[PDB]
Symmetry: D3
């Protein structure tokens, strides 16, 4: 009867999250049982549709981790349907303006605080009769910052009461600033942009998250005071592991 990421935050500690681009329940449960506070299912840069995300949310919850979704788009009706299927954290792409941040906030909260439609199929099963009283606290909402425009509008995005804060996509931010879309990019202008967003989030009393492609990059981001750190995509970790196993099998 608590959001595990929110419990971390209430203790003044960051949350470490997994990141799934591969559909299915077995790896979802296994990774949820490791020392992850949450597991983010990526519905943007993956082949995971609604049909496949639904049982994965169940598997992550059984594993003991908070099920999160990175959506395809900041669409209120998509986000509401994931909340009612037991997604307890939302990362919405391409939040570039206050109005887009208000669109995300609108989907996370029942009236009067937003316009979330009422039919909480799975949250009512998890939280029971006392769900509606605490519904807003059961859900974490992060607006993605991955453009020049979002960078320019960061203080107006952070002024929106109904979002917990922001989630940095460093590779898309690198690409939008005219740099190589490198995994864990340390391009100086992108590093400055990322530090600026982190500073503005904490100045506004808001949370800041970041996508990492490695444990090493995630350690530095945790040391820099990021509230929500993801590492690393199941597909990238599996491909790296398989390459290494093959190299060791084939070695002289």
């Amino acid at each position: 009867h608590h959001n595990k990421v929110r419990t971390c935050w209430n203790e003044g500690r960051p949350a470490l999250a997994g990141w799934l681009q591969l559909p299915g329940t077995l790896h979802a449960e296994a990774l949820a049982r490791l020392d992850y506070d949450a597991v983010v299912i990526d519905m943007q840069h993956s082949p995971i549709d609604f049909g496949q995300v639904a049982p994965m949310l169940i598997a992550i919850e059984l594993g003991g981790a908070e099920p999160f979704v990175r959506t395809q788009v900041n669409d209120p009706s998509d986000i509401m349907k994931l909340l009612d299927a037991g997604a307890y954290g939302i990362i919405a792409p391409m939040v570039n303006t206050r109005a887009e941040a208000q669109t995300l906030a609108s989907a996370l909260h029942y009236s009067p605080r937003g316009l979330r439609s009422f039919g909480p199929r799975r949250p009512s099963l998890r939280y029971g009769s006392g769900y509606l009283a605490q519904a807003s606290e059961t859900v974490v909402g992060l607006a993605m910052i991955e453009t020049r425009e979002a960078l320019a509008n960061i203080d107006e995005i952070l002024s929106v009461d109904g979002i917990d804060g922001v989630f940095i996509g460093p590779t898309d931010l690198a690409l939008d600033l005219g740099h190589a879309p490198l995994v864990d990019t340390e391009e100086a202008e992108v590093v400055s942009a990322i530090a600026h967003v982190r500073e503005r989030a904490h100045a506004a009393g808001k949370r800041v998250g970041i996508f990492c492609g490695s444990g090493g990059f995630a350690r530095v981001k945790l040391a820099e005071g990021f509230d929500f750190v993801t590492a690393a995509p199941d597909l990238a970790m599996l491909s790296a592991a398989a390459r290494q196993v093959i190299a060791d099998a084939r070695a002289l």
Copy 2:
């Protein structure tokens, strides 16, 4: 051409992946690494027929030979996988000559076996001359994972219509009264594994083995195993995630 059979014909072993996670994306990505084949496990996984079918397509596009470790040595199940573009079969619990003959029966059209004719995907890969070459397009391995199979190894290896045997060493360890540890050092299990390899090669047959690590796979290749699997997608992914979390949390 069957890429495993090409390895063997060029005097080289095959290195194979091993999938317990359903889905096409990791299947294609691992197929594109330096694997000759990728085995889809339909026994110790939740992969049903519905999920295996597009995975075989994804492995083939990746450039690796799609293999299936079946739930059971059942001829009709094996025939449906062959017609869906499974070009290698590893059948569990082949403990007798008669069970090895049941496996062979499913891999070959009449007169050599009783494979039913309707090759939906092989006829697309191989074209109208598929029948003449059908037996050579498929690799069949009988699993050795019991004391009984170990006792009957010579009679299993006498069946002309299987390429040879595939050692399941965790089940073999368990059936011998030892811990079911992958890549075991247990003296009796190591002796039994070497024995099966020696008997397979003495009978002019191929021998494969399931491995949990690249380091163990290297030794098995050096010992002369024809078909070496390393390592299950789920085991590799869990180990990689544990390590990433340890690096993140210092």
Copy 3:
């Protein structure tokens, strides 16, 4: 070769409809074979995606009931794809303005009456060569009224020629008015709002539907002159039935 809800209406009788939040064809056919005129598949407050709705529409039609969908969102392209898969009734959420009611109407009718795209895969199989001539009559469209704004705009929503009328969500209307989201809410302000919408729909020569959580509430709504009454969600009926079976099994 008739919409069964439209046949009820042409005889001056209301239609009684089922309501499915559980995916699958077996309960869909079984409930379609009961004394329901239609069966609504809920794609908003359920885990039912397009992949799962498609065979359910087939099952409801075989059962003898009119297949309806309550969509996730009033999106024309979503609604058109359901019509071409054999959805013969559409209930669109969050129709708060005339322009939003015009967006719903646009999806239900071929040019010149709307902008429905032509490729009627399943309706052409049901209706045969005479489909295009009667296509608009084969489909029932209802705009959902579940906000203060929709209540304020009810006469402008009802002025849209291409919708059959409106569908009241009483629980969301209760929540949006600052009341408890109760099943079959009788909160006085919500009861007044609901009676107002019914009066305005019938004054405009339009149909009014309502969601019910019970047979008892549905009987009253039919007695009040509602044209389209749903009762009750498969999940709620199944959970209530299971609770009662367990209570009888465990009794002294």
Copy 4:
């Protein structure tokens, strides 16, 4: 712990749900009611392996022990369900001691049976010490639904590796030449059902029964049945919908 086995160890019977409708949402909701277990029917339903797999997860999250009534007493099918987190098995058409031995063979690792080792989901629930306790994590019941099974009840009950028997009373009614009515009052069927219960308890074994109603389930619990199912999701939902329509239409 296996929640049915905990009931039994604390001298209480288990009350179970029964699912013929595929999907996770009703499975979790019913699991969260006062059911000790929820049986997924893979025989008299359209539930295939693809659909059962996430349902077992949903029941476990709900707090109930996930059970499966299989299509057939097939060892390889049963082993794949155990490795997907089925913690109870009800196998149809167990008519002989040999068929009861086939069921037991699938539930236990060597030396006690021939269960293949690769416990994907049980190793996640139970951790690295799963092998030592694997047999106790699983409840196995042989179905009694024929005159033959009734005649062979003592020989079926002599098999040490099954917890006991599960009466399918509609099929038993049909095979005795009576109407296949659930919760039957047919004198001969009631006598046969009481006989099976008496013989199971005399052999120190558990007895279960399929029920169509809460009222019949109450009597079966009062008679000393260890495992009582009431009632199928489809039958409960159809009855509830008929009643709602009758109330709506006056």
Copy 5:
């Protein structure tokens, strides 16, 4: 009523479609053409149980009798398809009287067979009086596709609980040592096919045959075949696409 059985009772043969492509849309569209039945092939296709279930619904809505050609003559597989609204069964590799008896056992409730009782979809179509008429709602055909089946034709035809036999002429051609060509002119295959038809009609039983073309189907109907399939969705679609491309490219 079973629409194939209605044809037969009115002294007419049935013409059937044949589906190797999964999905409901083509299944309903072809069901609405002048086919009496539509066979879903679960052997030489990637159609699993998950995909067959909604296809049976789609064919029934179309107005044609839904049939399944199973992967194997397995009673439990056949019973699950009957309870999902398969109203015709074509079982492969029926080579002996005992195998024909195994098919009959699955199609009939006790006392006539051992069909398990839980008719989910037939009870919705036929209502509470389904048991009394269940056997007549289902058409059962044993496949003849081997020299052995040909040799045992009289003993196969002696089994009262099958409507008759279904010739698989490509497999029969292959097992006789000929090219597995559909609609073959091979003298010995044509003689064997006529022989099976003559023996089926002499025993008061029905005979069906798989055809690759409308022209061959016309001849088989003129020869007195009771159940004629023409032609597989995949073969018809590929031929149609080749022709469209030839017309487009001049």
Copy 6:
């Protein structure tokens, strides 16, 4: 390592494409192996959802043909998710204005040329390390012209740099102009409209495609200089073939 449609165009030859409304991989691979340059999966006038399109794209690529998708809607996030699943051609419906053509272009190209989000799961596997350098060339984008409005705005639609050109839906264009939605319509006003669009596309140095319901109509469109010709829908070809087989089986 080339888009097969783009290779045709670079040789000054048109591409011939298949058209799939039936879900599944087996017919997709079989048709891909015929003398088609591409195979279009229709996600608008079909029951094919994302879950079903994903393995079909794999099957078409294995067959040797370029996998294309006709989307349900011109939605950037939908189009991006198909590109990352190995859709290498996009046909977007209801492009009626320059701004709508700019919305399509925005989804097909990484920054600076558009705003495509970076996570190319399947294109990175096909193209390897040299993908980002050539990413825009790997993808073909066509705006659908199927309304009066699109016809009126054809030169403004064709002025958008980031689209290869346009795709004519002749049946929807017939319907929107107040004519019968006939397969391969030769309604004089529709034939004039279609010739006008073809002339304007080639005057702007842009490509023009067209949907055909027959090989005979496709031959004429190729002879008229259309760059991209589809013929014919799998469902229509299969139903026609089945009718003919039945007629031959039943003939005296």
